[PDB]
RNA sequence: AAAUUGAAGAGUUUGAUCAUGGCUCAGAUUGAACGCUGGCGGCAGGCCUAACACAUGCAAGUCGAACGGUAACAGGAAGCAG
């Protein structure tokens, strides 16, 4: 029912004639726990405002994910520029074995049993982007059946 | 019947950013040592260095059913003296 959680809040600076201008960026992630997950990156002069902006962004532009019984559909890799991510379905009771950002994104998405690792850069925004991309691309057996022109029973 | 149920990151370069890239940390372990402290038990372990030098005691004897035998001991026998 739209569970949301803020991964990282980071202070960034701009320089002007006067001096430095600080502002805050908030990376949040929302999801319905049934497949839908979406991340948002808001910027404002103060943290709460930034978070609100991020939340609105995340709530819009969500994406559907094919989940098989609260777990992944197959082992999937994902990249986004520096962040290359691996995530593998695991037996019921394994829990989310996943990094920071990754854990958040998976949890809001609704995966209950995963084995993840973040290779490459572990920059939260890029890592979240990578995970969402991987989750999105991951197809289900009904999808493969549709593509190949067979029944799901012939493929298994 | 069961005996692979298995994979987490963080700090640190920049006014800020992403990347590269090192350093550091979170875990487990030990024939450990040192500091402070210290009640009991169970089960293990205990010269990693000088294969350096070694006082002293012990760590390989046994068989008389292989053999001459009796140093003893322990006993009887024969000779005896009270
Ligand atoms: Mg030695």
Collect all residues with Cβ–Cβ distance below 8 Å to A58 and sequence separation of at least 6: A4, A28, A29, A30, A38, A39, A40
Is strand B in 7 Å reach of the CB of A2?
Answer: no
Resolution for this PDB entry, in angstroms: 3.0
Length of chain A (residues): 156
Å from CA of A117 to ligand 1 middle? 46
DSSP sequence for A7-33:
EEEEEEEEE-SSSEEEEEEEEEEEE-S
Nearest 5°: phi and psi at A111? -75, 125
Å from CA of A86 to ligand 1 middle? 50
**Strand B nucleotides within a 7 Å radius of protein CB atoms:** 5-10, 15-20
Is strand B in 7 Å reach of the CB of A25?
Answer: no
| Cα(A61)–Cα(A50) distance, integer angstroms | 18
């Amino acid at each position: 029912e739209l569970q949301e959680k803020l991964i990282a809040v980071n202070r960034v600076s701009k320089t002007v004639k006067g001096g430095r201008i600080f502002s805050f960026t908030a990376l949040t992630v929302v999801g319905d726990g049934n497949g839908r997950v979406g991340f948002g990156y808001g910027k404002a002069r103060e943290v709460p405002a930034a978070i609100q902006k991020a939340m609105e962004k995340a709530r819009r532009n969500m994406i559907n994910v094919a989940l098989n019984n609260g777990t992944l559909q197959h082992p999937v890799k994902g990249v986004h520029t520096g962040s290359r991510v691996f995530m593998q379905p695991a037996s019921e009771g394994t829990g989310i074995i996943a990094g920071g950002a990754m854990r958040a994104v998976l949890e809001v998405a609704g995966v209950h049993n995963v084995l993840a690792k973040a290779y490459g850069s572990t920059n939260p925004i890029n890592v979240v982007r990578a995970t969402i991309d991987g989750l999105e691309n991951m197809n289900s057996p009904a999808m493969v059946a549709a593509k190949r022109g067979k029944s799901v029973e012939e493929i298994l």
